[PDB]
Structures are given as structure tokens and as C-alpha cells.
Amino acid sequence: NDPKSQLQQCCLTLRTEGKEPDIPLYKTLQTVGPSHARTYTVAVYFKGERIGCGKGPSIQQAEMGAAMDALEKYNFPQM
Numbered sequence: 001n002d003p004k005s006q007l008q009q010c011c012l013t014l015r016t017e018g019k020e021p022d023i024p025l026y027k028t029l030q031t032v033g034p035s036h037a038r039t040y041t042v043a044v045y046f047k048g049e050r051i052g053c054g055k056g057p058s059i060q061q062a063e064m065g066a067a068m069d070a071l072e073k074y075n076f077p078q079m
Contacts, residue, residue, distance in 0.1 A: 002026075002060070004067040016078040022047055023078075028059055042066050049075055 003026050014023050024046040031038045042062040044052030051073035054065025 002063065004063070007067060007070065014078050019078075024051065026063065044070055046075065047079060051075070 007026070011023050011025065016022065024044055026042065026044060029041050029043060031040055033039045039055060040057060040059055040062050041055050042052065042059065043050065044066060051070045052066035053069060054062055056062040056065060
């Protein structure tokens, strides 16, 4: 496990029939920076709608910032 429990529980509620299994899930990105320095960024996408944004060192820390933000950035259900 690793994702926030609230996010996991919410994913279950998002069920759509007669369409494709579209659900906003977490996916670790790749660290890319101008300097040799490494930067970790985690983003959550919903049918092309961003609802997460937060940068940090470790992945866990990055998830915490974006995880809380996603609560106030939720839009209409499975469209």
C-alpha cells in the first residue's frame, strides 16, 4: 500500500457501466531537471483534469502534499 486511504475508498465509489473503466489513479512520474539535481513530482489526472500538484524529495512526501489538495480539487463524477 502507499496511496491515501480516502483516495482508495473514493476510487471504489467511482463505478461506470456502459463505458470504459476511467478512474483517477496515482502514477509516479520521472525526475527531470536542468541540473544534475533530482526532483520528484507526483500528479493526479482525471479525464484530462488535473487535481493534484506538489513537489518534494521522497515519493511519500510528494503524495502527502498532492493527496490533501485532491480533496478540494474534485469535480463531477465519472463523466
